[PDB]
Amino acid sequence: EEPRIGVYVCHCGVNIGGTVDCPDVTEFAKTLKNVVVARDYKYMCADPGQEMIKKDIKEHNLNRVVVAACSPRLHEPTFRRCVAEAGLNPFLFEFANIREHCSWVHMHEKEKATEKAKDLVRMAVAKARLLEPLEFIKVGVTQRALVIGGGVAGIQTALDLGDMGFETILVEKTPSVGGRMAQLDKTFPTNDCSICILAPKMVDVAKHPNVKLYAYSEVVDVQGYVGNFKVKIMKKARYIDETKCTGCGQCSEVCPIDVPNEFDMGIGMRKAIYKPFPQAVPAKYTIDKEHCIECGLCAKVCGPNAIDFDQEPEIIEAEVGTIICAIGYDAFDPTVREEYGYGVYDNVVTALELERMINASGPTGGKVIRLSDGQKPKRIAFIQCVGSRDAKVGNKYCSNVCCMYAMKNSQLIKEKSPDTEIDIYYMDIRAFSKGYEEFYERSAKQYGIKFMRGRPSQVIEDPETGNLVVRAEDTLLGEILEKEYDLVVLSVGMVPTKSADEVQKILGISRTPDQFFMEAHPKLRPVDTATDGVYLAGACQGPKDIPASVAQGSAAASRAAIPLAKGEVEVEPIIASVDAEICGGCGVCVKQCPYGAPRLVEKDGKVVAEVISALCKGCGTCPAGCPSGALEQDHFKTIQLFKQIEGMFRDT
Amino acid sequence: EEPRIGVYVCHCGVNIGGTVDCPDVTEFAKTLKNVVVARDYKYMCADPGQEMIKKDIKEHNLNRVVVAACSPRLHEPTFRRCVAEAGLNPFLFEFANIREHCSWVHMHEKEKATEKAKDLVRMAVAKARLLEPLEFIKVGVTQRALVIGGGVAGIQTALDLGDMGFETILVEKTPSVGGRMAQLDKTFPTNDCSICILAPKMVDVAKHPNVKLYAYSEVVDVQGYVGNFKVKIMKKARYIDETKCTGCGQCSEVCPIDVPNEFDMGIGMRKAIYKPFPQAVPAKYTIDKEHCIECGLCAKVCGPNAIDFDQEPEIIEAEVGTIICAIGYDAFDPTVREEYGYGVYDNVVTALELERMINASGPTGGKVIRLSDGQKPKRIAFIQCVGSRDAKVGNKYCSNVCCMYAMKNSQLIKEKSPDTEIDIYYMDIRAFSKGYEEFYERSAKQYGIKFMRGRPSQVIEDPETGNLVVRAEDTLLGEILEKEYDLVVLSVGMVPTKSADEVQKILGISRTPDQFFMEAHPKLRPVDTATDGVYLAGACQGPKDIPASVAQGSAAASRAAIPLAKGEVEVEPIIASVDAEICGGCGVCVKQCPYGAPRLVEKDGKVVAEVISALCKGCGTCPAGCPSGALEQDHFKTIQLFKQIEGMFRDT
Ligand SMILES: Cc1cc2nc3c(=O)[nH]c(=O)nc-3n(C[C@H](O)[C@H](O)[C@H](O)COP(=O)(O)OP(=O)(O)OC[C@H]3O[C@@H](n4cnc5c(N)ncnc54)[C@H](O)[C@@H]3O)c2cc1C
Ligand SMILES: Cc1cc2nc3c(=O)[nH]c(=O)nc-3n(C[C@H](O)[C@H](O)[C@H](O)COP(=O)(O)OP(=O)(O)OC[C@H]3O[C@@H](n4cnc5c(N)ncnc54)[C@H](O)[C@@H]3O)c2cc1C
Ligand code: SF4
Ligand code: SF4
Ligand code: SF4
Ligand code: SF4
C-alpha cells in the first residue's frame, strides 16, 4: 500500500513557534511525496491535538503520522497510544524533534532554525515512508519487586509493596539497613530522634512476611527487561556464622587491627571484626577482610566458634518484575576547597561528622569536642553551601538540606550548651517547606543563633591554640569580618554515593548534570526512569530531605506496582532477526551480542544464524556488523536509515 | 487474676537520667502493690531493653508492663509489639511520660522532677492494674477509591490507582480538570508548557476504564470509616447534555451576556455558556444560570440539541474504601498589604494574573500589558514573599514556589521582549531542588534578570501616568532605591482553597498552623492523615510545586492502595459499649456522638442503648456524659481514670 502521511507541527505555545516558523514548516511539509495532510497546532499532545490526529487518520485514511514537536523520550508513547486508538499501528508513527534539538538551541537564528525544522520533518517523512507495522510484544510480569538500597527511601518502598501483598526483595550493601538517617542524631523541623523513629520501620522491614531482606549484599548482575528481570545477588561473607551469632561483641577486643569507622565518618575507630551501630538491623557482626590479617586471635576468644574464614559468598538468583533504585548519597569531600582547610586543620569538620559527634551513640558519647585538644567549643561557625552552588568544584546545584540541618544542629548545641555562641555564614536561607521558615525564625528568636550573610573567603588556623578564624564579608554591612572560633563546621553538600557508577552500569540508567540518577521526566514522571520497570527513590535521584525521600519511596512503590498489578506489559519489537535465505552462517554476529541472542544453527541441511527474539534488547549492533545484510533490526533497518540520510539533503 | 507488674525506667542516655534519678524511681516503683519487677535501663526502646521486657514477661509471668520513658505518641506501637511478641496483650501495657513531660521541662529542678517521675509511674501503675485485654476489630475494605480534586495531584492519584486496576472515582469542583497548572503558561525549571505535562494526563484520566470522572461535581457527605465509606456526590447542573454535546462552541459566539472569567482571574470575559479554557477536559460547555438571561440564542445554533434548562442536580451514592484529598490551593489576596496598592493601582498585579496574561490562550492573547492603558511594560518589578513570611497577614511560612515562578516568568518576558528591564525584589532566593539553582544562575547570566535584596516598603502610583514606584532598601549597598516601573508584579503566596473548610468538616481531618491539611507525621507518613483511610496529595497539604505534587499523588495512590490490596483492615478497640444490665434507656448518649454510633433499641421487651462498634472512633464523650455509668470506653473507663487520679497522691 502507498504511504499517506499526516504531518503535525507543534508550536508548544511559543516554545517552538517563537523561534521556528511553524506555519511555514507546515507549508513545506505538504510539498513532500505522500504527505496528504499537514497541520500546525499550539499543543499537539493536548486533547484537541490528539483528537485532530485521530479524526484525520480516519477521514484522510492515513497510514503514517509525523509529529514535529518535543523529544520522543517525552511523548513518543503518548502519540503511539493516540494513533493506535485511531487504528494506526504505533510503529507507523515518527517523531521529529524540533524543540530540544532546534527551537530551544537556535533561539537567535530563527530563519536557520526554520530551515533546520524543515529538514528534520523531511528526514522523518523519509523514514516514515519505509516504516512497517510491528506487534508490541506482550510479556508477563513476575510478581516480585527488587529494592536496591536499605535507607528510609528503600525501606518505605519495600514496606508499601509488601503491605500491598507483593513479594519484595530488599538488598542492602552495608551490614545494616537505616542509611544516613541512622547516622543522624535528630531530624528537622520537628527535632525528632532520627533512629528513635527509623528503628520501628527497620524492624518492620526485617520481619515483614512479604519482604526478603538481604543485608551485607550487593546486586552484581541484572539481565532481562521489564517484568522479566533475572537478578544475581551476592550475599557477601561476614566470616561469622549468621545463625550462631549472638551479637555480644567479645571477639573484637583481641583484634590488633584498627580500621576507621565508616559509620562515624572517620572519627571513630573500629576493628576488622565489628558492628556498624547499636540499633543495627539485623543485629550481627562482620569481619572486614580488606583489613583482616587472619591472625586468628578473635577465634580463640569466640565461644561459639561462629568465626569461619572458609565462609564463601553465596550468589542468589532471583526473578523480579520491577526494580527500585534507592542507593542514596554521600557527603561531599571538602578537602578540594583548600582555603577552608579541611584535612589540614584539626578543628574544621563536616556537618555529617558533627552529627556523629552529637549523636549519643557516637564516638565522643554525644559530646561536641575539638579534635585537637578534646575541649568543648565555646564559639562555633557554620559555613553554608560547602560543595554546592560552586562551579570551582563542579557542583552548580543546591544540596537542599544544608540550610536546615545547620540551623537544627545549632539548636541542639544550644540545648546542650546555652553559653555556646553560634554564627551561620550563608548566602540564602532555604527554609522552603512546612514548618521550615518557622524553624528558621525559631533558631534566631528562641535559640539566639546568629546569621551572617556572606560566603566565607577562607579559614585560618592559629597554630598556637588550634582556633580558627573565618574571613568573610558581612554583605549586609559592607564590612569584612575576621571572627575567631573554637570549631568550624562545614555544611557539606550531597553527592552521588560511590557505588552509583556500578549500579548505573547494572541497571542501564542515566545521570543528570548534578551526577544523580535521571528521572524519566521531572514532572510527568518523577520516580520513573527511561528504562522500563526501573524506578528511583530518595537522594540517589537528587538532594532532598527525609519526608521527600519517604514520599518518593511511596511513589516508587505505586509506579512499580502498576506492572505487577497488571501482570502484563507491552515491550518494543525493535529486535533483530536473520533472513535465512541470505545468511551463509559466517558467525560474525554471535559474539557481538552481550546477551547471546544470535546463535548458529542447522536449517534445511546447512548452517545459518538465528536470533532468539526474547534475548534481543534491540541495540542494532549485530545487524550493523553483519556483512551479508541478512540481519536487520526492525524499525532501524539500513534502508530506513539510508532514506533518513537522503532526507536531510533531498526528498526521497 | 491478680496484677503482676513490670516497671521499666528509661534513662534515654542522659535525657531522662541527667535530670530524673532513675535508679531512685525504680526503687520507689517496687514499693507499689503488684509490682513484681522494676528495672532501669539506658535505652528501653533498644533491642536489649525490648528483650529485657520480653524475657521478664515470661520468667516472672507478668500480665501488666509499665514503661516510664518518653511519649506514647512516639513509641506506644513499639512497646505494644514488644509485649505482644512475648504473649502479653498490647492493651495491658501502660506508658508513663517522664521525658517530654518531666526531665526536659524540669532540668533545673532535679529533686522535684524525680518526685514528679515517681508520681507519674504511680499514676501509670494505678491505671495498669485495672487495664483489660482488648482485641482489634477487623473490617472489610470496599475495592474502590475516591479522589477529591482534579488538579495534577488528584489526576496522578487516579491514574496510578486505575492503572493498578482499582475502581477509582475522581470528583472535580469546576467544569474541567487541570487545576492551577492548567492556568500556567510554562512550568519551571524545564520551561515546558504546563499543557506539555498536564494535558496528556487530563486526556488519559477522562478515558480511563477504571476511573469515573465526575466534573462540575462536589462531595457533599461522607459517612462511615476506613474501608466502609458511604459517599454522596452532587452532580451539579451544567444545563447541557454532556453525551450529546460536541464542544464546538457555536453557542459561545451567539450568547449576548458577558461574565468575568474565573479561570482568567477576572482579567478575561467569558459568556454565560462556556468552556473554562480551550484545552478543557471534558471538552464540554456549561451554562452559568447566575448570569444566563434564558434568551435561547445558544440553543438555535446547537446541532445535537444539547441545551436543557430543565436540568436538575443528581445525588450519586457511592461506596469507597479509601479517600484522597487533593483540592489544591488558592492564591493569596494582597489587598491587605495596603502599601503595595493591589486593588487600588491598575498596574499592580498578582503573579497568577500575570500567568494568564502571558499564556497564549489567555485574555490578552499572551501579551503582557498594563491594565490602565493596554501598553506593553518596558520596566517590570517583581516583589517576592507577598503574603508569605509575614506575621502582619498571619502567614509566617514560605509559599515554596514564588522565587522560582518569578524567575521563570521573567525569562518568559525576556524571550518575548528582550528590551524589557526586570528587577526582582527579594530576601532569599529559594532555588532548592534539582535544576533550580541552575535555573536561578541562568535567569541572571543568560537573560540578564536583575535581583535586589530588599523587601519593598511600599509601592506608589503616579496618578497621571499609571507608573509605579517601588520604595525599597538595596540591603547589599545600604542605600534606599526608588525605581520607577511600568508594571509591578506581586509574587503572591499560597493559601488553602476556599472550599477547604467544607472538605475538612466532611472528611474529619485537621489543619496545621499554616491552615493547610495536616499529615499523620511529617517525616514518616507525609501523605496519610490521622483519620484512617483518608490521605492527602498536592498543595492542600502544603505549598509545593508540580514535581512534588505529582510525587505526592503517586505516594497517596500507594498508601491508599494498601488497605484496598489487603481487603481487610483493623481498628483500635478503645471504643464505647453499653452494659445492658445497667442502661435504663435514658437517651442522653444518642445525640452526643457526631457519628451516630449510640442508638436506642428494644431488647427482651425493654429499651436499652447499644453502640454500633464500627461507627465509634473512641473519643469517650458519651461514656463521660452517661449518668448511669452503663456506657464505658474501653481503655479509658471511669474507674481506670479514677485510680489514675488517686495515683498522683497515693498508692491504689
Ligand atoms: C549532615 C546531614 C544532616 C541531615 N539532616 C537531616 C534532617 O535533620 N532531617 C531530614 O529530613 N533530612 C536530613 N538530611 C538528609 C537525609 O540524610 C536524607 O534525606 C536521607 O539519608 C535519604 O535517605 P535515602 O534512603 O534516600 O538515602 P540513604 O539514607 O543514604 O540510604 C541509602 C542506603 O542504600 C545503601 N546502598 C548504597 N549503595 C548501595 C548499593 N550499591 N547496593 C545496595 N545498597 C546500597 C546505603 O548503605 C544506605 O543504607 C541530612 C543530610 C546530611 C548530609
Ligand atoms: C503564579 C504561580 C505560578 C506557579 N508556577 C509554577 C511552576 O512554574 N512550576 C511548578 O512546578 N509549580 C508552580 N506553581 C505551583 C503549582 O501551581 C502547584 O504545585 C500545582 O497547581 C499543584 O496542583 P494541585 O493538584 O496540588 O492543586 P490545584 O492545582 O490547585 O488543583 C486543585 C483541584 O481541585 C479542585 N477542587 C478544589 N476544591 C474542590 C472540592 N471541594 N471538590 C472537588 N474538587 C475541588 C480544583 O478545582 C482544582 O482542579 C505556581 C503557583 C502559582 C500560584
Ligand atoms: S562472633 Fe562470637 S563473641 Fe563475637 S559477637 Fe558473635 S557470638 Fe559474640
Ligand atoms: S583474624 Fe582478623 S578479625 Fe580476627 S583478630 Fe586477627 S585481624 Fe582481627
Ligand atoms: S540548602 Fe542551603 S546551605 Fe545547602 S546548598 Fe542550598 S543554600 Fe546552600
Ligand atoms: S553476521 Fe549475518 S551472515 Fe554472518 S552468521 Fe550472522 S546473520 Fe549470518
Ligand code: SF4
Ligand atoms: S540487535 Fe543483535 S547485538 Fe543487539 S541485543 Fe539484539 S541480538 Fe543482541
Ligand code: SF4
Ligand atoms: S524508650 Fe523513649 S526515652 Fe527511652 S531511649 Fe527510647 S526514645 Fe529515649
Ligand code: SF4
Ligand atoms: S509537550 Fe510536545 S506535543 Fe505537547 S505542547 Fe509541548 S512540544 Fe507540543
Ligand code: SF4
Ligand atoms: S453549540 Fe452545542 S454541541 Fe456546540 S459546544 Fe455549544 S452546547 Fe456543545
Ligand code: SF4
Ligand atoms: S440562553 Fe443563556 S447561555 Fe444561551 S445565549 Fe442566552 S444567556 Fe447565553
Ligand code: SF4
Ligand atoms: S519561595 Fe521565595 S518568594 Fe516564595 S515565600 Fe519563599 S522566599 Fe518568599
Ligand code: SF4
Ligand atoms: S446515656 Fe447511659 S443510661 Fe442513658 S441510654 Fe445511654 S447508655 Fe443508657
Ligand code: SF4
Ligand atoms: S465514645 Fe465518642 S465516638 Fe464512641 S460512640 Fe461515644 S461519642 Fe461516639
Ligand SMILES: [Fe+3]
Ligand atoms: Fe526510642
